[PDB]
Amino acid sequence: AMQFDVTIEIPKGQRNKYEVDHETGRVRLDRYLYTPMAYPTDYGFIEDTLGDDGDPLDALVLLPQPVFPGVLVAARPVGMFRMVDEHGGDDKVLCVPAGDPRWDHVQDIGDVPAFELDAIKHFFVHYKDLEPGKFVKAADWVDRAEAEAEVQRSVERFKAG
Amino acid sequence: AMQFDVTIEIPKGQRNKYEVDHETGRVRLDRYLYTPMAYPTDYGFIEDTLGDDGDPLDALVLLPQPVFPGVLVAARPVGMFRMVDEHGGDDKVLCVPAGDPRWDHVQDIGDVPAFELDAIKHFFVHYKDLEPGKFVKAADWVDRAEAEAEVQRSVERFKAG
Amino acid sequence: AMQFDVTIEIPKGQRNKYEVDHETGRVRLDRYLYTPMAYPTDYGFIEDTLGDDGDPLDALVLLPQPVFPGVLVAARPVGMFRMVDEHGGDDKVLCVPAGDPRWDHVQDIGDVPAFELDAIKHFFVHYKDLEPGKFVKAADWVDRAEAEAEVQRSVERFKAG
Amino acid sequence: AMQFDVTIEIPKGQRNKYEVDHETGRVRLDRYLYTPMAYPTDYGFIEDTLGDDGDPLDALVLLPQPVFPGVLVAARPVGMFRMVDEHGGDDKVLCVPAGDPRWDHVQDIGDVPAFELDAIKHFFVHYKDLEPGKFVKAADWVDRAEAEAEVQRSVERFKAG
Amino acid sequence: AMQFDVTIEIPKGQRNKYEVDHETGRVRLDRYLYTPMAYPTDYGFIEDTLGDDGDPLDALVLLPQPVFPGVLVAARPVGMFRMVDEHGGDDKVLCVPAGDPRWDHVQDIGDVPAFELDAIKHFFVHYKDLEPGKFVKAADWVDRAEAEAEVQRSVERFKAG
Amino acid sequence: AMQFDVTIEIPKGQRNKYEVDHETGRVRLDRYLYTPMAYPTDYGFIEDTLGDDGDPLDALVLLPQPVFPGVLVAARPVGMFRMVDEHGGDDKVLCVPAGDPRWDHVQDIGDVPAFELDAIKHFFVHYKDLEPGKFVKAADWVDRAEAEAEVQRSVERFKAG
Numbered sequence: 001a002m003q004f005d006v007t008i009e010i011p012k013g014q015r016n017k018y019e020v021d022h023e024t025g026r027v028r029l030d031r032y033l034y035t036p037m038a039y040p041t042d043y044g045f046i047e048d049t050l051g052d053d054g055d056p057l058d059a060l061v062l063l064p065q066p067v068f069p070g071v072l073v074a075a076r077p078v079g080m081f082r083m084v085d086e087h088g089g090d091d092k093v094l095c096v097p098a099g100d101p102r103w104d105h106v107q108d109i110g111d112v113p114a115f116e117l118d119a120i121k122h123f124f125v126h127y128k129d130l131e132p133g134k135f136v137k138a139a140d141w142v143d144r145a146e147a148e149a150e151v152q153r154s155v156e157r158f159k160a161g
Numbered sequence: 162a163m164q165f166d167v168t169i170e171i172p173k174g175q176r177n178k179y180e181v182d183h184e185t186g187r188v189r190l191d192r193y194l195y196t197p198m199a200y201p202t203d204y205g206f207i208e209d210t211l212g213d214d215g216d217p218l219d220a221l222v223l224l225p226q227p228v229f230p231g232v233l234v235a236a237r238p239v240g241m242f243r244m245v246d247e248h249g250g251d252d253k254v255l256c257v258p259a260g261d262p263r264w265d266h267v268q269d270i271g272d273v274p275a276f277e278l279d280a281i282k283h284f285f286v287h288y289k290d291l292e293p294g295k296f297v298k299a300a301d302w303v304d305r306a307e308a309e310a311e312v313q314r315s316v317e318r319f320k321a322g
Numbered sequence: 323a324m325q326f327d328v329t330i331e332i333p334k335g336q337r338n339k340y341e342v343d344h345e346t347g348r349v350r351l352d353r354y355l356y357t358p359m360a361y362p363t364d365y366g367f368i369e370d371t372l373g374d375d376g377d378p379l380d381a382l383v384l385l386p387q388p389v390f391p392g393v394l395v396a397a398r399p400v401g402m403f404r405m406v407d408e409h410g411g412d413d414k415v416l417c418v419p420a421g422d423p424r425w426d427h428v429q430d431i432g433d434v435p436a437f438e439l440d441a442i443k444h445f446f447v448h449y450k451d452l453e454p455g456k457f458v459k460a461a462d463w464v465d466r467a468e469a470e471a472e473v474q475r476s477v478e479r480f481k482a483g
Numbered sequence: 484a485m486q487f488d489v490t491i492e493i494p495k496g497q498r499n500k501y502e503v504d505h506e507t508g509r510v511r512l513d514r515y516l517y518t519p520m521a522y523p524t525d526y527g528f529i530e531d532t533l534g535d536d537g538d539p540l541d542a543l544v545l546l547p548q549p550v551f552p553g554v555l556v557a558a559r560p561v562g563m564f565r566m567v568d569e570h571g572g573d574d575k576v577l578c579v580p581a582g583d584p585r586w587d588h589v590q591d592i593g594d595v596p597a598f599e600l601d602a603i604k605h606f607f608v609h610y611k612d613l614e615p616g617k618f619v620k621a622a623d624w625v626d627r628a629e630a631e632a633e634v635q636r637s638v639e640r641f642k643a644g
Numbered sequence: 645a646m647q648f649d650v651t652i653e654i655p656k657g658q659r660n661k662y663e664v665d666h667e668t669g670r671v672r673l674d675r676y677l678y679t680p681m682a683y684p685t686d687y688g689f690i691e692d693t694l695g696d697d698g699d700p701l702d703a704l705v706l707l708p709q710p711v712f713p714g715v716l717v718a719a720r721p722v723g724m725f726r727m728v729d730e731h732g733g734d735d736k737v738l739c740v741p742a743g744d745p746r747w748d749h750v751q752d753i754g755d756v757p758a759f760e761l762d763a764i765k766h767f768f769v770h771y772k773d774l775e776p777g778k779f780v781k782a783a784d785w786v787d788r789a790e791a792e793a794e795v796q797r798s799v800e801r802f803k804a805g
Numbered sequence: 806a807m808q809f810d811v812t813i814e815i816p817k818g819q820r821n822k823y824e825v826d827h828e829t830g831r832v833r834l835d836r837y838l839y840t841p842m843a844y845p846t847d848y849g850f851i852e853d854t855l856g857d858d859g860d861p862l863d864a865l866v867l868l869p870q871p872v873f874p875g876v877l878v879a880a881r882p883v884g885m886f887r888m889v890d891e892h893g894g895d896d897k898v899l900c901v902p903a904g905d906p907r908w909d910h911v912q913d914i915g916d917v918p919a920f921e922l923d924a925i926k927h928f929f930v931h932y933k934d935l936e937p938g939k940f941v942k943a944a945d946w947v948d949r950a951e952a953e954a955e956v957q958r959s960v961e962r963f964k965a966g
């Protein structure tokens with residue numbers, strides 16, 4: 001089964017948006033969000049990847065308790081959230097903790113409840129509503145096979161360099 | 162100057178929606194919100210009032226640090242958020258702490274920054290997006306004179322009974 | 323379907339053990355726990371009940387986010403944790419929030435994962451290990467039909483008085 | 484040994500100052516403190532007392548973990564902090580949890596370390612520095628015998644009424 | 645306009661005092677404060693500077709929500725807090741987040757309210773009261789032009805080396 | 806007196822178990838604990854050591870307020886918790902903050918109260934009860950002289966390499 005390390009930038013329930021400077025590895029505060037919304041899951045990027053937009057591939061990790069910015073988590077994909085914004089393509093791979101038997105019944109996107117997927121969709125659709133010249137469109141949930149394919153080629157793109 | 166006590170139901174930054182049973186005075190959990198949003202200010206109702214919808218008049222209080230559910234706060238109005246939802250009319254009076262000199266430059270709705278008012282508007286417009294058969298419309302900010310008038314008549318309505 | 327109000331005494335993740343004085347309705351700190359353990363779910367009692375030990379019937383409520391001590395929650399039973407301690411019988415009804423469609427797939431004790439039930443069992447078995455003259459025994463999970471029966475007779479016992 | 488119930492108004496580490504309305508029993512926010520200071524211990528008043536200033540006798544309770552406003556704690560005195568402010572006399576009885584063997588080596592004011600007593604003194608001396616027309620003077624730590632005497636007469640004063 | 649990166653050592657509302665080892669870049673706990681006081685703003689140092697005392701130039705950053713130790717924040721100066729302690733000179737540049745339109749009305753020290761500046765002054769004047777052989781004196785607020793000048797020469801001093 | 810730097814991995818009161826990758830220095834989430842237990846003290850490892858099991862020597866640090874993962878703390882030993890688990894030997898040195906006069910009365914294991922040592926023992930004995938093929942045995946508290954000896958040889962082992 002596929003497995004990778006996700007560096008968590010943003011803990012769940014945060015209104016601060018943290019980034020990592022990929023040159024130095026330092027955590028940076030991007031901004032305090034302009035809307036009254038909180039990140040629905042722990043958010044980060046997959047280590048040693050180069051995604052479809054020239055930045056590392058983003059990842060959502062379902063955790064029982066949040067972690068701190070900069071922490072590594074061994075994760076496995078169960079699906080992916082596909083979206084296009086002002087950057088360009090900006091897809092997020094949905095993951096669970098790898099090697100944890102408490103998440104063994106979550107194998108594909110159908111195993112995740114609709115209310116949770118709807119909530120995650122709602123965040124990314126609406127969190128930049130009050131920022132001018134920033135939108136999102138083409139929001140769509142896809143299965144694990146599609147998620148594994150995008151991880152695979154993002155590792156290939158990274159190795160070429 | 163006008164002054165009243167607000168019973169805070171919901172602290173700022175909460176995703177739990179608390180109500181008060183007005184018969185008993187007990188705090189009740191209404192629901193965990195279906196959207197990934199947090200209450201932008203401390204939220205409650207004005208004591209000894211009966212609003213335009215047959216329930217007590219709601220109030221938003223700007224606090225530097227949040228309080229707990231059930232706590233009283235002496236407040237004064239600076240404006241009001243006017244809205245209509247599935248209940249009917251459901252206006253919220255915007256307030257600051259009374260007798261605190263740190264809020265003396267906030268006297269009317271123009272003194273509150275646009276980014277804060279936009280954020281408060283955004284919460285109430287979008288927080289019930291994933292609940293079916295629940296909407297809001299006619300969202301509008303009004304000045305202190307209009308807010309003081311609605312408080313005044315809500316006290317009259319309450320005394321008649 | 324059966325439904326009742328649970329008054330939450332202890333939030334999830336707390337090491338403080340709160341009780342309610344049933345004469346006054348006041349929240350009281352019983353004690354800070356002697357073991358390094360935290361309450362695995364939100365813990366309280368069902369209103370207007372008199373259980374098999376002469377005190378109100380205890381209840382465990384599965385919540386996504388914890389509440390404060392004294393808060394009411396409309397709940398429905400899905401099972402029960404049966405145990406005997408130094409008090410005598412001391413059963414806890416396992417519940418979920420009533421009227422919430424996100425918990426509709428949890429109807430009986432089989433729908434709750436083993437890891438969660440094992441964790442809840444582990445707390446009540448071990449949390450009084452360092453308190454002398456305090457034990458527990460006969461720890462056992464039972465189904466909803468058994469839970470509904472104990473609620474039913476505890477309401478009957480309460481009405482007789 | 485002497486024992487009494489303390490109603491905790493203010494948790495440890497808080498910058499919000501809560502009071503209780505003694506007519507209704509409701510918790511009220513007095514104010515957010517003007518200095519960058521936090522309450523060094525859990526703070527409240529002893530139930531059914533009338534102190535040397537016409538209000539209930541205040542109490543500081545040493546707890547391992549803080550509680551919520553309005554919670555009762557069975558406590559026993561080990562000393563008292565004597566002070567005079569703009570109100571008049573305003574003494575605070577230092578207490579530990581009663582019936583807890585982990586506090587059995589704390590019997591009198593000498594058993595409490597100097598650094599903790601100095602820190603508690605520092606709070607009450609300096610927390611109203613930026614509020615005009617508010618001071619404190621005659622700050623002094625006294626032993627348990629003196630504390631027990633003030634509790635005793637404050638109960639007598641309360642019973643006369 | 646002037647702009648720089650501040651590495652936040654201490655979040656707002658903390659009683660732990662963190663430092664950074666400038667050789668390694670590791671966060672270190674200096675000490676738990678001896679007084680019952682909390683840091684009034686987020687506190688750190690400006691990257692790539694060498695101040696008037698041979699250490700990096702300290703900075704206070706006004707944030708709506710606190711960050712974690714080690715996080716970078718792009719900031720711009722609006723003033724400076726001038727003080728002398730047992731180290732020697734130990735000035736702190738007051739900043740707001742750069743490129744955030746919500747702070748555009750804060751351009752100079754006059755735009756910051758007196759209550760906030762008084763509170764920040766109060767912390768640094770009193771937080772070492774219970775530490776022997778440690779004082780502060782010559783506490784004074786100065787404008788942006790003075791702050792920009794000290795940043796400018798601290799960058800020059802750093803480049804010389 | 807002996808003194809060393811402890812890198813804190815796990816803050817007190819956490820159910821997340823963090824490790825450090827000793828190759829990179831990155832913090833990693835090992836797992837969310839399977840039992841409803843929280844870490845009784847701040848937990849980490851001593852820098853530049855190689856213990857009796859081929860990994861760095863673990864350390865428990867008594868702090869008044871918890872720190873974040875990755876933070877350095879100058880500590881001194883007062884005792885050691887000796888235990889054998891599925892790894893092999895896995896001893897933990899009990900420490901207090903070095904150069905802090907508030908901990909000067911804690912010099913050896915006898916100065917630490919029995920309730921605290923019992924609680925720490927209880928955590929490590931029971932926290933892996935629900936993980937299969939994981940046990941602990943030979944749990945025993947030893948004095949400072951024994952702790953200093955194990956630190957001494959773990960530094961020797963580290964220097965050989």
Ligand SMILES: c1ccc(-n2cccc2-c2nc(N3CC3)nc(N3CC3)n2)cc1
Pocket residue numbers: 062063064102103104105106111112113116435
């Ligand atoms: C499927 C996927 C996720 C969830 N879900 C939503 C909120 C929390 C969870 C959750 N949370 C957990 N853990 C670690 C405590 N486990 C699961 N399980 C697959 C059975 N689900 C429920 C069903």
Ligand SMILES: c1ccc(-n2cccc2-c2nc(N3CC3)nc(N3CC3)n2)cc1
Pocket residue numbers: 223224225263264265266267272273274277757
């Ligand atoms: C006008 C009204 C509110 C705000 N505002 C937005 C977030 C926090 C505040 C705030 N917060 C405070 N306090 C108590 C710490 N005071 C004020 N002032 C009127 C000057 N504003 C700023 C300007």
Ligand SMILES: c1ccc(-n2cccc2-c2nc(N3CC3)nc(N3CC3)n2)cc1
Pocket residue numbers: 113384385386424425426427428433434435438
């Ligand atoms: C069955 C029962 C409970 C859980 N469980 C364990 C931790 C959190 C949950 C949980 N949490 C949630 N909510 C409100 C966010 N929903 C559910 N679901 C029935 C599908 N489960 C998972 C499966």
Ligand SMILES: c1ccc(-n2cccc2-c2nc(N3CC3)nc(N3CC3)n2)cc1
Pocket residue numbers: 545546547585586587588589594595596599918
């Ligand atoms: C005497 C009195 C108080 C303290 N002290 C200061 C901070 C925490 C404590 C404290 N905290 C505790 N508990 C419950 C965890 N127990 C004690 N003991 C009397 C031995 N002290 C230490 C010595």
Ligand SMILES: c1ccc(-n2cccc2-c2nc(N3CC3)nc(N3CC3)n2)cc1
Pocket residue numbers: 274706707708746747748749750755756757760
């Ligand atoms: C001037 C400078 C600072 C403040 N002040 C004090 C506490 C919070 C604030 C504050 N907080 C905010 N944000 C981000 C939420 N914005 C501002 N504004 C310049 C209008 N002020 C108020 C007026």
Ligand SMILES: c1ccc(-n2cccc2-c2nc(N3CC3)nc(N3CC3)n2)cc1
Pocket residue numbers: 596867868869907908909910911916917918921
């Ligand atoms: C001996 C060793 C530890 C403790 N103890 C247990 C919980 C907190 C403490 C504690 N906590 C503290 N600090 C920093 C606030 N100081 C001490 N003292 C040696 C006197 N003890 C009490 C007695």
